[PDB]
């Protein structure tokens, strides 16, 4: 049971990373953690919660299905099975397979707000969170939305509060957003791994976890209030509007992804460029990162042997989109691999890589969020990397909780 | 057939019913419009020389479009080639790659033409004819004359000086014809979708006097009226780009709408599943709803069941979703076979921008042009949609009349 | 080899002459500067295209850039999966090469990259150095120099931003020098695009490095300096903050920017090509009467610019073709030209082009000079200096001509040093 120990190590890291340890609201953070693990057992181990989890996952499976239908229309056969039949795994085309679902969830989002549904669920859940852990209404709203909808799409509803909110609340939105898995990305993994309820629970663990680590860094200052044109006439107006918005957002995202991935490749090339000089060549950044996160890899309860690979994967997770990490991941889960699953390590890696710690997500959030409040730009971007580490640790804590329920 | 005259009478009547002042109308005008519309109707769809001319037009335009697909073939490469069909079958047709680029191309082309001054001339002419026969103001005349060809963002270039000073009626006219017509872009799109071209052409020319018709029926004029690119290459570019962002917006819009409709039909499937309807679909509902109106226009009941659904999808969602479900029936492999006059009536009744979203579009864009009247715009609101819809409808009835009267085709 | 070099120098003399003919004031052309530029251009030509160390630097450059491009392609591979794989080649054949998917993304990438390298401060440095050299030898203004230097790497994508404080108040000759330098320049972004299209990389590199001083050359030949330059103590720069927050934000901003650029370019091409097919249709049809219905725009232009093509050293046999291509460059743009150029490169071609010609054309096509780029200048500069907008629009055509001539001279040089190797 290195799990609790691991948790301690994590929180220790937070403190080390924390700006102010004296301002920490324990009534907030401890409660958050508590809630996270509580929900964890709730959906997973004890109280037959896997049932409502199942109905949920089913429902959402149908959602993703619908989006997939629309896409099947717009892009025709390029998303069909024949692509696999010819190209194989490469037949899976992320651009077509995933990014449009941003448009879908954006539209759906707008629709619900026109209906008043998201209003309700956000009001309720955010109400609860704010009640127990005492964080401000806004950040609660955001973290609430993050469960259902995606990080990309989330900031659309915090806009009246953005110019208003403090450094702290802002950083909370940033972090929670990063750690969140919903909407686009959810469907994304479903297209590949498809472990629906795992990702579900990952979301429900992510949001308050984000809240947790966000308050372990920039806990509190002052307070905030609500501040009130072009508004949707009918449901269709909404649908189309949110669709377009989501579209150009998606384009942005794509460009970003291409960029960063390519850049990291460039960095490999750099590393090799120095190494072959230095006589010691053929060195991969992947291995470097492996060594780097290795202790951390072990701490969470991953056996050493497996911890090497795991650490590599996590390095990739931070500096590259989670999907690449996933690629080499299943490259390990495929047979003929010296590494084993251990029937724990697999699970604990899985949850860990669910979120977005990728720098690309910084760029996205910080960018758009800057567009909504250009005066806060410098502030936002200052906190990007911190936020990465935070959300990272959120997914990681979720993974530790998984490690807990691995045994029996 | 008398049934047609029934349709006409009914529609016109409905227009009258909604009028602000029924006694304020100018008979010379509205009857002028009606008479002109049906005149064109016969002219293109009845007389042999007419259908010949129309056919030649269709060929020419199709050659244009062909050039478009040539450029397309360049950009996306073999992804549009034949090999795709061999591989994916009917799924080898990729809506995005096949269609939207034509929005691009035509946007560019139209920019070019508007620059060179061709459209200037044509708009001048047709506008002239209209104000001559209908006694419409030069502003609204040129407007309706223009809305045939151009559209989307480039459409209100000619009306922009008048708008702020433009009357309540003429405004609603621009609104109306704005909705009734279609841009050349989305038109070509439709062609690529497999939609019959000639009928599209005819409808496009029918819109303007139809638009003016119902505009004047609903809101007559009680008050008196009045009265940048460098070189060609650049113009072509700007047109292409503008068209591109338009295309993107369209694609996203369609994806959204489709997926949503699927989701909703999921829900309704659930609800009606209580009574034992798993076949319950919003489609079927809408069809059941407009079925009477679907019949009035001259569609046989058996086929009116579907016609209602399609027209419905036009109204509540859009034209693209509609045509997308319509073209399934035109394919040879299609189970259900349809009457020719049905194909006609539908194809015409579906040509127009009249829908719910177009409201928002008008409001926003025109507000950007003349925000002072934005209140007036929203105030009018759906009345415009009604007008355009009815224009498309009357046109469709005419179509059914003559196509049913002689031969037509597929 | 006698007639080779003779004809080359002849061409040089021709271009320069035509320049002087169109000059505003024939008098007061500072020779030190113009001949300096000329000699620098031909110098670099001698460097990369002839002497071994030159080709060492150039070869190494090409390799490096190629690797960068490979990284970008790794990114592309990420997004579009199998659609970029070899399967598309084997299944779809030549049609398996998808322009949109295999080119524009590179524009995205290099946009990001150049943004980063600009952020870290590398570009500012290189610019400052090279422009230092240029202002030193040529005696031109600091502004002009910095501009022409910056445009070797970042083209119309990002504003030069080095001249932002200088633009408003700079003179006609400086303005026109920036304009010209712009049109002759090639963005780093659009470069890789050219590359993937099958265009030879080294020639591109060389073309750009040659381009900057060439732009300066014909700028000064057309519009000599009749007035005082600016002193850096005379200026308020402003322009605080704006786009980049940090290296991340940099890579992103560059990414998105490059994206919408790429889209714009895509639609641009779609339209242009289709329109060309259309016009060729018309010309064919009408031409059916006089007996040639195979007549095209390509053919006409080739039948037009042929003499010039000969002048720069292209043989008469290949003249019509070369002139065709360059024609398309002038009246439309570069992407179109290269698009039909590469068809002569593949070994399966129905036509064999001499190495010398291949080089010549390869260079003569490198630049943004066209009739379509004017507006870009106009607007882009108008934002920075609205009062000068009229002055800009006055100079557009002339600038087109300048950059054109720059590219031409560079091509000539190439043609000389190829026969010498
Ligand atoms: C109709 C239209 C304009 C569309 C104009 O044509 C009209 O034709 C009638 C015939 O009597 C004249 O009367 C009217 O005065 C005249 O306006 C259709 O004509 C366009 O141009 C050509 C007709 O002049 C058509 O030419 C077609 O046939 C030709 C045979 O060689 C070829 O050019 C080609 O097959 C085809 O273009 C053209 O289709 C049509 O767009």
PDB file of N, CA and C in Angstrom, chain B residues 64 67-72 74-84 87-88 101-102 104-106 108-109 112-113 228 230-234 236-237 240-241 243-245 248, chain C residues 83 88 91-92 95-101 104 197 263-275 277-278 281-282 331-333 335 339 371-372 374-376 378 389:
ATOM      1  N   UNK B  64     -18.940  25.325 -66.258  1.00  0.00           N
ATOM      2  CA  UNK B  64     -18.321  26.165 -65.258  1.00  0.00           C
ATOM      3  C   UNK B  64     -17.963  25.348 -64.031  1.00  0.00           C
ATOM      4  N   UNK B  67     -15.085  23.144 -64.396  1.00  0.00           N
ATOM      5  CA  UNK B  67     -13.814  23.812 -64.176  1.00  0.00           C
ATOM      6  C   UNK B  67     -13.541  23.890 -62.684  1.00  0.00           C
ATOM      7  N   UNK B  68     -14.594  24.181 -61.933  1.00  0.00           N
ATOM      8  CA  UNK B  68     -14.471  24.209 -60.490  1.00  0.00           C
ATOM      9  C   UNK B  68     -13.878  22.916 -59.981  1.00  0.00           C
ATOM     10  N   UNK B  69     -14.501  21.807 -60.353  1.00  0.00           N
ATOM     11  CA  UNK B  69     -14.035  20.502 -59.929  1.00  0.00           C
ATOM     12  C   UNK B  69     -12.657  20.200 -60.464  1.00  0.00           C
ATOM     13  N   UNK B  70     -12.227  20.937 -61.480  1.00  0.00           N
ATOM     14  CA  UNK B  70     -10.870  20.780 -61.963  1.00  0.00           C
ATOM     15  C   UNK B  70      -9.919  21.354 -60.935  1.00  0.00           C
ATOM     16  N   UNK B  71     -10.215  22.566 -60.488  1.00  0.00           N
ATOM     17  CA  UNK B  71      -9.412  23.174 -59.445  1.00  0.00           C
ATOM     18  C   UNK B  71      -9.412  22.313 -58.200  1.00  0.00           C
ATOM     19  N   UNK B  72     -10.589  21.806 -57.865  1.00  0.00           N
ATOM     20  CA  UNK B  72     -10.733  20.914 -56.735  1.00  0.00           C
ATOM     21  C   UNK B  72      -9.823  19.719 -56.880  1.00  0.00           C
ATOM     22  N   UNK B  74      -7.245  19.515 -58.396  1.00  0.00           N
ATOM     23  CA  UNK B  74      -5.884  19.934 -58.122  1.00  0.00           C
ATOM     24  C   UNK B  74      -5.592  19.940 -56.640  1.00  0.00           C
ATOM     25  N   UNK B  75      -6.417  20.647 -55.882  1.00  0.00           N
ATOM     26  CA  UNK B  75      -6.103  20.886 -54.483  1.00  0.00           C
ATOM     27  C   UNK B  75      -6.037  19.610 -53.648  1.00  0.00           C
ATOM     28  N   UNK B  76      -7.133  18.865 -53.599  1.00  0.00           N
ATOM     29  CA  UNK B  76      -7.210  17.685 -52.747  1.00  0.00           C
ATOM     30  C   UNK B  76      -6.635  16.433 -53.383  1.00  0.00           C
ATOM     31  N   UNK B  77      -6.316  16.500 -54.665  1.00  0.00           N
ATOM     32  CA  UNK B  77      -5.718  15.365 -55.339  1.00  0.00           C
ATOM     33  C   UNK B  77      -6.659  14.187 -55.466  1.00  0.00           C
ATOM     34  N   UNK B  78      -6.100  12.984 -55.455  1.00  0.00           N
ATOM     35  CA  UNK B  78      -6.855  11.784 -55.761  1.00  0.00           C
ATOM     36  C   UNK B  78      -7.957  11.431 -54.789  1.00  0.00           C
ATOM     37  N   UNK B  79      -8.061  12.177 -53.700  1.00  0.00           N
ATOM     38  CA  UNK B  79      -9.093  11.917 -52.716  1.00  0.00           C
ATOM     39  C   UNK B  79     -10.479  12.080 -53.306  1.00  0.00           C
ATOM     40  N   UNK B  80     -10.577  12.838 -54.388  1.00  0.00           N
ATOM     41  CA  UNK B  80     -11.815  12.941 -55.143  1.00  0.00           C
ATOM     42  C   UNK B  80     -11.852  12.068 -56.393  1.00  0.00           C
ATOM     43  N   UNK B  81     -10.807  11.290 -56.632  1.00  0.00           N
ATOM     44  CA  UNK B  81     -10.755  10.497 -57.852  1.00  0.00           C
ATOM     45  C   UNK B  81     -11.715   9.319 -57.803  1.00  0.00           C
ATOM     46  N   UNK B  82     -11.747   8.549 -58.885  1.00  0.00           N
ATOM     47  CA  UNK B  82     -12.671   7.429 -59.021  1.00  0.00           C
ATOM     48  C   UNK B  82     -12.367   6.278 -58.083  1.00  0.00           C
ATOM     49  N   UNK B  83     -11.086   6.083 -57.796  1.00  0.00           N
ATOM     50  CA  UNK B  83     -10.625   4.967 -56.983  1.00  0.00           C
ATOM     51  C   UNK B  83     -11.408   4.902 -55.679  1.00  0.00           C
ATOM     52  N   UNK B  84     -11.781   6.074 -55.179  1.00  0.00           N
ATOM     53  CA  UNK B  84     -12.544   6.190 -53.946  1.00  0.00           C
ATOM     54  C   UNK B  84     -13.836   5.387 -54.013  1.00  0.00           C
ATOM     55  N   UNK B  87     -13.271   1.838 -53.704  1.00  0.00           N
ATOM     56  CA  UNK B  87     -12.983   1.481 -52.327  1.00  0.00           C
ATOM     57  C   UNK B  87     -14.184   1.601 -51.392  1.00  0.00           C
ATOM     58  N   UNK B  88     -14.779   2.786 -51.330  1.00  0.00           N
ATOM     59  CA  UNK B  88     -15.781   3.078 -50.310  1.00  0.00           C
ATOM     60  C   UNK B  88     -17.222   2.976 -50.769  1.00  0.00           C
ATOM     61  N   UNK B 101     -15.752  23.287 -51.689  1.00  0.00           N
ATOM     62  CA  UNK B 101     -14.854  24.006 -52.585  1.00  0.00           C
ATOM     63  C   UNK B 101     -15.570  24.756 -53.690  1.00  0.00           C
ATOM     64  N   UNK B 102     -16.779  24.345 -54.031  1.00  0.00           N
ATOM     65  CA  UNK B 102     -17.512  25.065 -55.048  1.00  0.00           C
ATOM     66  C   UNK B 102     -18.045  26.358 -54.460  1.00  0.00           C
ATOM     67  N   UNK B 104     -16.300  27.996 -52.406  1.00  0.00           N
ATOM     68  CA  UNK B 104     -15.100  28.802 -52.585  1.00  0.00           C
ATOM     69  C   UNK B 104     -15.018  29.379 -53.987  1.00  0.00           C
ATOM     70  N   UNK B 105     -14.927  28.485 -54.958  1.00  0.00           N
ATOM     71  CA  UNK B 105     -14.778  28.867 -56.344  1.00  0.00           C
ATOM     72  C   UNK B 105     -15.786  29.897 -56.785  1.00  0.00           C
ATOM     73  N   UNK B 106     -17.068  29.600 -56.638  1.00  0.00           N
ATOM     74  CA  UNK B 106     -18.086  30.568 -57.023  1.00  0.00           C
ATOM     75  C   UNK B 106     -18.011  31.870 -56.270  1.00  0.00           C
ATOM     76  N   UNK B 108     -15.288  33.332 -55.367  1.00  0.00           N
ATOM     77  CA  UNK B 108     -14.250  34.015 -56.124  1.00  0.00           C
ATOM     78  C   UNK B 108     -14.766  34.536 -57.454  1.00  0.00           C
ATOM     79  N   UNK B 109     -15.344  33.640 -58.238  1.00  0.00           N
ATOM     80  CA  UNK B 109     -15.843  33.980 -59.555  1.00  0.00           C
ATOM     81  C   UNK B 109     -16.784  35.161 -59.502  1.00  0.00           C
ATOM     82  N   UNK B 112     -15.054  38.309 -59.065  1.00  0.00           N
ATOM     83  CA  UNK B 112     -14.475  38.714 -60.331  1.00  0.00           C
ATOM     84  C   UNK B 112     -15.493  39.425 -61.200  1.00  0.00           C
ATOM     85  N   UNK B 113     -16.643  38.792 -61.371  1.00  0.00           N
ATOM     86  CA  UNK B 113     -17.680  39.336 -62.222  1.00  0.00           C
ATOM     87  C   UNK B 113     -18.160  40.682 -61.718  1.00  0.00           C
ATOM     88  N   UNK B 228     -11.858  47.945 -50.665  1.00  0.00           N
ATOM     89  CA  UNK B 228     -12.206  47.866 -52.075  1.00  0.00           C
ATOM     90  C   UNK B 228     -11.061  47.290 -52.884  1.00  0.00           C
ATOM     91  N   UNK B 230      -8.370  45.990 -55.801  1.00  0.00           N
ATOM     92  CA  UNK B 230      -7.449  46.733 -56.636  1.00  0.00           C
ATOM     93  C   UNK B 230      -7.486  46.196 -58.046  1.00  0.00           C
ATOM     94  N   UNK B 231      -6.893  45.027 -58.236  1.00  0.00           N
ATOM     95  CA  UNK B 231      -6.915  44.375 -59.530  1.00  0.00           C
ATOM     96  C   UNK B 231      -7.679  43.067 -59.485  1.00  0.00           C
ATOM     97  N   UNK B 232      -7.832  42.432 -60.639  1.00  0.00           N
ATOM     98  CA  UNK B 232      -8.683  41.260 -60.753  1.00  0.00           C
ATOM     99  C   UNK B 232      -8.186  40.095 -59.911  1.00  0.00           C
ATOM    100  N   UNK B 233      -6.877  39.891 -59.909  1.00  0.00           N
ATOM    101  CA  UNK B 233      -6.277  38.769 -59.217  1.00  0.00           C
ATOM    102  C   UNK B 233      -6.635  38.836 -57.746  1.00  0.00           C
ATOM    103  N   UNK B 234      -6.421  40.008 -57.173  1.00  0.00           N
ATOM    104  CA  UNK B 234      -6.745  40.244 -55.783  1.00  0.00           C
ATOM    105  C   UNK B 234      -8.194  39.969 -55.490  1.00  0.00           C
ATOM    106  N   UNK B 236     -10.247  37.980 -57.060  1.00  0.00           N
ATOM    107  CA  UNK B 236     -10.442  36.545 -57.091  1.00  0.00           C
ATOM    108  C   UNK B 236      -9.997  35.934 -55.782  1.00  0.00           C
ATOM    109  N   UNK B 237      -8.866  36.402 -55.283  1.00  0.00           N
ATOM    110  CA  UNK B 237      -8.346  35.899 -54.026  1.00  0.00           C
ATOM    111  C   UNK B 237      -9.306  36.162 -52.878  1.00  0.00           C
ATOM    112  N   UNK B 240     -12.254  34.072 -52.954  1.00  0.00           N
ATOM    113  CA  UNK B 240     -11.980  32.695 -52.594  1.00  0.00           C
ATOM    114  C   UNK B 240     -11.907  32.536 -51.092  1.00  0.00           C
ATOM    115  N   UNK B 241     -11.178  33.423 -50.438  1.00  0.00           N
ATOM    116  CA  UNK B 241     -10.977  33.315 -49.002  1.00  0.00           C
ATOM    117  C   UNK B 241     -12.277  33.481 -48.246  1.00  0.00           C
ATOM    118  N   UNK B 243     -15.157  33.068 -49.321  1.00  0.00           N
ATOM    119  CA  UNK B 243     -15.894  31.860 -49.590  1.00  0.00           C
ATOM    120  C   UNK B 243     -15.422  30.725 -48.720  1.00  0.00           C
ATOM    121  N   UNK B 244     -14.141  30.717 -48.388  1.00  0.00           N
ATOM    122  CA  UNK B 244     -13.592  29.613 -47.627  1.00  0.00           C
ATOM    123  C   UNK B 244     -14.153  29.639 -46.230  1.00  0.00           C
ATOM    124  N   UNK B 245     -14.112  30.803 -45.596  1.00  0.00           N
ATOM    125  CA  UNK B 245     -14.616  30.866 -44.235  1.00  0.00           C
ATOM    126  C   UNK B 245     -16.101  30.562 -44.258  1.00  0.00           C
ATOM    127  N   UNK B 248     -16.451  26.768 -44.347  1.00  0.00           N
ATOM    128  CA  UNK B 248     -16.206  26.199 -43.035  1.00  0.00           C
ATOM    129  C   UNK B 248     -17.426  26.340 -42.158  1.00  0.00           C
TER     130      UNK B 248
ATOM    131  N   UNK C  83      -3.437   8.996 -44.481  1.00  0.00           N
ATOM    132  CA  UNK C  83      -3.668   9.811 -45.664  1.00  0.00           C
ATOM    133  C   UNK C  83      -2.382  10.384 -46.224  1.00  0.00           C
ATOM    134  N   UNK C  88      -1.266   5.708 -50.013  1.00  0.00           N
ATOM    135  CA  UNK C  88      -1.944   6.616 -50.920  1.00  0.00           C
ATOM    136  C   UNK C  88      -1.220   6.629 -52.258  1.00  0.00           C
ATOM    137  N   UNK C  91      -1.908   3.026 -53.965  1.00  0.00           N
ATOM    138  CA  UNK C  91      -3.308   2.886 -54.336  1.00  0.00           C
ATOM    139  C   UNK C  91      -3.789   3.902 -55.364  1.00  0.00           C
ATOM    140  N   UNK C  92      -3.575   5.179 -55.073  1.00  0.00           N
ATOM    141  CA  UNK C  92      -4.105   6.254 -55.903  1.00  0.00           C
ATOM    142  C   UNK C  92      -3.153   6.715 -56.989  1.00  0.00           C
ATOM    143  N   UNK C  95      -2.075  10.635 -58.118  1.00  0.00           N
ATOM    144  CA  UNK C  95      -3.146  11.349 -57.460  1.00  0.00           C
ATOM    145  C   UNK C  95      -3.083  11.144 -55.965  1.00  0.00           C
ATOM    146  N   UNK C  96      -2.256  10.198 -55.539  1.00  0.00           N
ATOM    147  CA  UNK C  96      -2.107   9.909 -54.128  1.00  0.00           C
ATOM    148  C   UNK C  96      -1.376  11.010 -53.397  1.00  0.00           C
ATOM    149  N   UNK C  97      -0.830  11.951 -54.153  1.00  0.00           N
ATOM    150  CA  UNK C  97      -0.114  13.051 -53.552  1.00  0.00           C
ATOM    151  C   UNK C  97      -1.098  14.168 -53.315  1.00  0.00           C
ATOM    152  N   UNK C  98      -1.413  14.400 -52.049  1.00  0.00           N
ATOM    153  CA  UNK C  98      -2.464  15.332 -51.698  1.00  0.00           C
ATOM    154  C   UNK C  98      -1.865  16.651 -51.283  1.00  0.00           C
ATOM    155  N   UNK C  99      -2.075  17.644 -52.128  1.00  0.00           N
ATOM    156  CA  UNK C  99      -1.468  18.940 -51.951  1.00  0.00           C
ATOM    157  C   UNK C  99      -1.808  19.498 -50.597  1.00  0.00           C
ATOM    158  N   UNK C 100      -3.096  19.605 -50.328  1.00  0.00           N
ATOM    159  CA  UNK C 100      -3.567  20.226 -49.108  1.00  0.00           C
ATOM    160  C   UNK C 100      -2.950  19.594 -47.893  1.00  0.00           C
ATOM    161  N   UNK C 101      -2.894  18.277 -47.891  1.00  0.00           N
ATOM    162  CA  UNK C 101      -2.420  17.569 -46.723  1.00  0.00           C
ATOM    163  C   UNK C 101      -0.910  17.518 -46.658  1.00  0.00           C
ATOM    164  N   UNK C 104       0.365  22.647 -47.122  1.00  0.00           N
ATOM    165  CA  UNK C 104      -0.072  23.721 -46.240  1.00  0.00           C
ATOM    166  C   UNK C 104       0.294  23.529 -44.755  1.00  0.00           C
ATOM    167  N   UNK C 197       6.523  20.394 -52.850  1.00  0.00           N
ATOM    168  CA  UNK C 197       5.961  20.333 -54.188  1.00  0.00           C
ATOM    169  C   UNK C 197       6.944  19.684 -55.147  1.00  0.00           C
ATOM    170  N   UNK C 263      -4.996  28.169 -45.162  1.00  0.00           N
ATOM    171  CA  UNK C 263      -6.342  28.093 -45.689  1.00  0.00           C
ATOM    172  C   UNK C 263      -6.531  29.104 -46.799  1.00  0.00           C
ATOM    173  N   UNK C 264      -6.168  30.347 -46.506  1.00  0.00           N
ATOM    174  CA  UNK C 264      -6.277  31.412 -47.486  1.00  0.00           C
ATOM    175  C   UNK C 264      -5.590  31.035 -48.785  1.00  0.00           C
ATOM    176  N   UNK C 265      -4.388  30.498 -48.664  1.00  0.00           N
ATOM    177  CA  UNK C 265      -3.619  30.096 -49.826  1.00  0.00           C
ATOM    178  C   UNK C 265      -4.331  28.995 -50.585  1.00  0.00           C
ATOM    179  N   UNK C 266      -4.940  28.081 -49.845  1.00  0.00           N
ATOM    180  CA  UNK C 266      -5.631  26.966 -50.449  1.00  0.00           C
ATOM    181  C   UNK C 266      -6.749  27.464 -51.322  1.00  0.00           C
ATOM    182  N   UNK C 267      -7.639  28.254 -50.737  1.00  0.00           N
ATOM    183  CA  UNK C 267      -8.767  28.771 -51.489  1.00  0.00           C
ATOM    184  C   UNK C 267      -8.277  29.572 -52.675  1.00  0.00           C
ATOM    185  N   UNK C 268      -7.230  30.346 -52.437  1.00  0.00           N
ATOM    186  CA  UNK C 268      -6.611  31.142 -53.474  1.00  0.00           C
ATOM    187  C   UNK C 268      -6.290  30.284 -54.678  1.00  0.00           C
ATOM    188  N   UNK C 269      -5.591  29.189 -54.429  1.00  0.00           N
ATOM    189  CA  UNK C 269      -5.202  28.291 -55.494  1.00  0.00           C
ATOM    190  C   UNK C 269      -6.387  27.666 -56.180  1.00  0.00           C
ATOM    191  N   UNK C 270      -7.344  27.212 -55.387  1.00  0.00           N
ATOM    192  CA  UNK C 270      -8.530  26.578 -55.920  1.00  0.00           C
ATOM    193  C   UNK C 270      -9.141  27.483 -56.967  1.00  0.00           C
ATOM    194  N   UNK C 271      -9.427  28.698 -56.532  1.00  0.00           N
ATOM    195  CA  UNK C 271     -10.008  29.690 -57.405  1.00  0.00           C
ATOM    196  C   UNK C 271      -9.144  29.899 -58.624  1.00  0.00           C
ATOM    197  N   UNK C 272      -7.891  30.257 -58.408  1.00  0.00           N
ATOM    198  CA  UNK C 272      -7.002  30.573 -59.511  1.00  0.00           C
ATOM    199  C   UNK C 272      -6.941  29.501 -60.575  1.00  0.00           C
ATOM    200  N   UNK C 273      -6.707  28.266 -60.166  1.00  0.00           N
ATOM    201  CA  UNK C 273      -6.588  27.180 -61.120  1.00  0.00           C
ATOM    202  C   UNK C 273      -7.873  26.994 -61.885  1.00  0.00           C
ATOM    203  N   UNK C 274      -8.982  26.961 -61.157  1.00  0.00           N
ATOM    204  CA  UNK C 274     -10.253  26.756 -61.821  1.00  0.00           C
ATOM    205  C   UNK C 274     -10.487  27.843 -62.856  1.00  0.00           C
ATOM    206  N   UNK C 275     -10.263  29.084 -62.453  1.00  0.00           N
ATOM    207  CA  UNK C 275     -10.421  30.216 -63.349  1.00  0.00           C
ATOM    208  C   UNK C 275      -9.555  30.069 -64.576  1.00  0.00           C
ATOM    209  N   UNK C 277      -8.608  27.303 -65.943  1.00  0.00           N
ATOM    210  CA  UNK C 277      -9.242  26.311 -66.797  1.00  0.00           C
ATOM    211  C   UNK C 277     -10.389  26.936 -67.571  1.00  0.00           C
ATOM    212  N   UNK C 278     -11.121  27.811 -66.900  1.00  0.00           N
ATOM    213  CA  UNK C 278     -12.264  28.478 -67.500  1.00  0.00           C
ATOM    214  C   UNK C 278     -11.827  29.358 -68.668  1.00  0.00           C
ATOM    215  N   UNK C 281     -10.764  27.600 -71.507  1.00  0.00           N
ATOM    216  CA  UNK C 281     -11.936  27.114 -72.202  1.00  0.00           C
ATOM    217  C   UNK C 281     -12.407  28.145 -73.204  1.00  0.00           C
ATOM    218  N   UNK C 282     -12.614  29.366 -72.724  1.00  0.00           N
ATOM    219  CA  UNK C 282     -13.067  30.446 -73.589  1.00  0.00           C
ATOM    220  C   UNK C 282     -12.145  30.668 -74.773  1.00  0.00           C
ATOM    221  N   UNK C 331       1.565  37.437 -63.636  1.00  0.00           N
ATOM    222  CA  UNK C 331       0.159  37.809 -63.659  1.00  0.00           C
ATOM    223  C   UNK C 331      -0.684  37.104 -62.613  1.00  0.00           C
ATOM    224  N   UNK C 332      -0.216  35.983 -62.078  1.00  0.00           N
ATOM    225  CA  UNK C 332      -1.040  35.281 -61.109  1.00  0.00           C
ATOM    226  C   UNK C 332      -0.362  35.123 -59.763  1.00  0.00           C
ATOM    227  N   UNK C 333       0.506  34.125 -59.646  1.00  0.00           N
ATOM    228  CA  UNK C 333       1.357  33.968 -58.473  1.00  0.00           C
ATOM    229  C   UNK C 333       2.376  32.858 -58.657  1.00  0.00           C
ATOM    230  N   UNK C 335       2.787  29.950 -56.676  1.00  0.00           N
ATOM    231  CA  UNK C 335       2.343  28.588 -56.436  1.00  0.00           C
ATOM    232  C   UNK C 335       1.819  27.946 -57.702  1.00  0.00           C
ATOM    233  N   UNK C 339       3.529  24.881 -59.581  1.00  0.00           N
ATOM    234  CA  UNK C 339       2.622  23.750 -59.672  1.00  0.00           C
ATOM    235  C   UNK C 339       2.763  23.077 -61.012  1.00  0.00           C
ATOM    236  N   UNK C 371       0.928  40.339 -59.661  1.00  0.00           N
ATOM    237  CA  UNK C 371      -0.084  41.371 -59.699  1.00  0.00           C
ATOM    238  C   UNK C 371      -1.081  41.184 -58.578  1.00  0.00           C
ATOM    239  N   UNK C 372      -0.909  40.130 -57.800  1.00  0.00           N
ATOM    240  CA  UNK C 372      -1.865  39.850 -56.755  1.00  0.00           C
ATOM    241  C   UNK C 372      -1.366  40.254 -55.394  1.00  0.00           C
ATOM    242  N   UNK C 374       0.108  43.085 -54.575  1.00  0.00           N
ATOM    243  CA  UNK C 374       0.036  44.516 -54.338  1.00  0.00           C
ATOM    244  C   UNK C 374      -0.870  44.855 -53.178  1.00  0.00           C
ATOM    245  N   UNK C 375      -2.101  44.374 -53.251  1.00  0.00           N
ATOM    246  CA  UNK C 375      -3.094  44.664 -52.237  1.00  0.00           C
ATOM    247  C   UNK C 375      -2.605  44.281 -50.857  1.00  0.00           C
ATOM    248  N   UNK C 376      -1.872  43.182 -50.771  1.00  0.00           N
ATOM    249  CA  UNK C 376      -1.354  42.735 -49.495  1.00  0.00           C
ATOM    250  C   UNK C 376      -0.445  43.797 -48.914  1.00  0.00           C
ATOM    251  N   UNK C 378      -0.459  46.947 -49.718  1.00  0.00           N
ATOM    252  CA  UNK C 378      -1.275  48.113 -49.468  1.00  0.00           C
ATOM    253  C   UNK C 378      -1.925  48.066 -48.105  1.00  0.00           C
ATOM    254  N   UNK C 389      -0.640  55.519 -47.423  1.00  0.00           N
ATOM    255  CA  UNK C 389      -1.324  54.519 -48.219  1.00  0.00           C
ATOM    256  C   UNK C 389      -1.380  54.875 -49.688  1.00  0.00           C
TER     257      UNK C 389
END
